[PDB]
């Protein structure tokens, strides 16, 4: 979760709404195991 610690303070002439981009990765103690099929791609219709 992300909370407001203080306010988003702005002067006259600058916009009152901004945006944040979140990026994610893994550390150097990260591993994976038991290689399997993914569930993101599918094939109901024939390709070409």
């Amino acid at each position: 979760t992300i909370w407001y610690q203080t306010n988003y303070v702005v002067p006259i002439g600058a916009p009152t709404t901004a945006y944040i981009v979140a990026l994610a990765a893994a550390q150097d103690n990260f591993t994976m195991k038991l290689c399997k099929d993914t569930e993101d791609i599918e094939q109901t219709a024939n390709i070409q």
């Binding site: 038991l34 290689c35 399997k36 099929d37 993914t38 569930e39 599918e42 094939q43 109901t44």
Partner: protein, 282 residues
């Protein structure tokens, strides 16, 4: 250092290939030395031997202790599943639970924890035992992977899932399966709930279910696009290899009812022993 209080197992293993020898002994008369009187309240077993209770001879015995080792006790293939394709569209998705047959279930539930590799054998025939030339495909679906929805599903492309193609007139297929739990051992008994939250009566099925033992789905099919006219009956057998076991338990004296709980028939409690009439007459 200004602060002085911040400065700060019983038994071992031995190789015993044979049973113990008996030494010769004679009579013994005296006071103070009583090896026959014990105290069972301490929780310890009796340490009295042959030579302290009777007069013995010398016996050099070479009876081996190899067969009662738990590697030899468990390395026998037993039935874990029977899968049938009369399920009329040519495929079965079977959720892997190996506690459905009482003979291997009672052997494994002698211990609380177990860590082993397995070897699975697939004996397939017709429901009357006859064999036909027919191609089949067995696929292991790990948890999270897409399971097949029909006989011609895309999941049978098996690009990463391990799959075996076999014929019914072939010898039975054998594969080796490693230890694949997220924990350090399989547990046949899990005293608790898997998730947090309130535990109401409608969610009482969650009690005792460990997700560290749930291994996925085993899928079978007939390979072709069209319907096969043959009925299938697949029997799965499992050998247990490279085994380690912890914490022995009482063996079950009641017949099993369900695959996931220790529930027992309460109107017919079986006594562990065979009854007799009088305590003085055998």
């Amino acid at each position: 250092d200004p602060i002085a209080d911040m400065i700060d197992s019983l038994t071992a293993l031995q190789v015993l290939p044979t049973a113990a020898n008996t030494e010769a002994s004679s009579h013994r008369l005296g006071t103070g030395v009583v090896p026959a009187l014990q105290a069972a309240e301490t929780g310890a077993s009796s340490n009295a031997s042959d030579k302290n209770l009777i007069e013995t001879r010398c016996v050099l015995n070479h009876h081996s202790t190899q067969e009662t080792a738990i590697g030899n006790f468990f390395s026998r293939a037993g039935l874990v599943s029977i899968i049938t394709m009369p399920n009329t569209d040519g495929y079965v998705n079977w959720d892997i639970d190996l506690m459905g047959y009482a003979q291997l279930r009672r052997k494994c539930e002698l211990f609380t924890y177990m860590r082993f590799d397995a070897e699975f054998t697939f004996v397939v025939a017709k429901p009357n035992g006859v064999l036909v030339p027919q191609l089949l495909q067995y696929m292991y679906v790990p948890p999270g992977a897409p399971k097949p929805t029909s006989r011609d599903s895309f999941a049978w492309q098996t690009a990463t899932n391990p799959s075996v193609f076999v014929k019914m007139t072939d010898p039975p297929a054998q594969v080796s399966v490693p230890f694949m739990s997220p924990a350090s051992a399989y547990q046949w008994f899990y005293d608790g709930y898997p998730t947090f939250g309130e535990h109401l009566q409608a969610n009482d099925l969650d009690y005792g279910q460990c997700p560290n033992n749930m291994m996925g789905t085993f899928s079978i099919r007939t390979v072709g696009t069209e319907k096969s006219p043959h009925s299938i009956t697949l029997r799965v057998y499992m050998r247990i290899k490279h085994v380690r076991a912890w914490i022995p338990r009482p063996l079950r004296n009641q017949p099993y009812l369900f695959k996931t709980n220790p529930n027992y028939k309460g109107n017919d409690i079986k006594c562990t022993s065979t009854s007799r009439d009088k305590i003085t007459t055998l």
